[PDB]
Amino acid sequence: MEVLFEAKVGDITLKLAQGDITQYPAKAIVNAANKRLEHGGGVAYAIAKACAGDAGLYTEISKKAMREQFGRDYIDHGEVVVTPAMNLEERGIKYVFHTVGPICSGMWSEELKEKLYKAFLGPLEKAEEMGVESIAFPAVSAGIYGCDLEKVVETFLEAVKNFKGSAVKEVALVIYDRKSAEVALKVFERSL
């Protein structure tokens, strides 16, 4: 795990790290999921298998948790489903916070931005609500949903800046690949 950036933002300490989010030292890690919590690919698959040993198993566990928490089999942007991290609990990761970002498919707009903003802010508020002091995020919607990475990072930063909390003390954005991590760093540098 390599920390590329660190500083005080909003009400917490923000870090930009390059590495595997399933190995990040945070009490809760956020999953960039689809509205049905079917973890079939990308970071959602990585987190799902890391937690249960079989992504399919975590998908079922997640669907059950979502029905229990929201009374339905899907979530809207901003809503967060909480599941036990299972096998990751040994690493200090107690929960996985599932959030759902919009599908840009190479486009951008105020509406798409708002949906993504909610996808980032929701997990922060859930952490605050649960007294979870540390949380790590992936670049939501920057995967197959095709939202421009720079726009995604800018929106994430906006959410962190606007976030009002006292329980949450540490927040991190975790990017797996070098090329993407550097793009993110560039945004952090000119925005903070």
Curated annotation (Swiss-Prot):
Signal sequence residues: none
Catalytic activity: 5-O-(ADP-D-ribosyl)-L-glutamyl-[protein] + H2O = L-glutamyl-[protein] + ADP-D-ribose + H(+); 4-O-(ADP-D-ribosyl)-L-aspartyl-[protein] + H2O = L-aspartyl-[protein] + ADP-D-ribose + H(+); alpha-NAD(+) + H2O = ADP-D-ribose + nicotinamide + H(+)
One protein family per Pfam: Macro
Domain of life of the organism encoding this protein: Archaea
Entry EC number(s): 3.2.2.-
Mutagenesis / variant outcome for changing residue 41 to D: Abolishes hydrolase activity
GO MF term list: ADP-ribosylglutamate hydrolase activity
Positions bound to substrate: 19-21, 32-34, 39-44, 140-146
Residue ranges of every copy of the Macro domain listed in the record: 1-192
Mutagenesis / variant outcome for changing residue 20 to A: Strongly reduced affinity for ADP-ribose
Record GO biological process: peptidyl-glutamate ADP-deribosylation
Keywords: Hydrolase
Function: Removes ADP-ribose from aspartate and glutamate residues in proteins bearing a single ADP-ribose moiety. Inactive towards proteins bearing poly-ADP-ribose. Catalyzes removal of a phosphate group from ADP-ribose 1''-phosphate (Appr1p), but with low efficiency.
Name used for this protein in its record: ADP-ribose glycohydrolase AF_1521
Lineage: Archaea, Methanobacteriati, Methanobacteriota, Archaeoglobi, Archaeoglobales
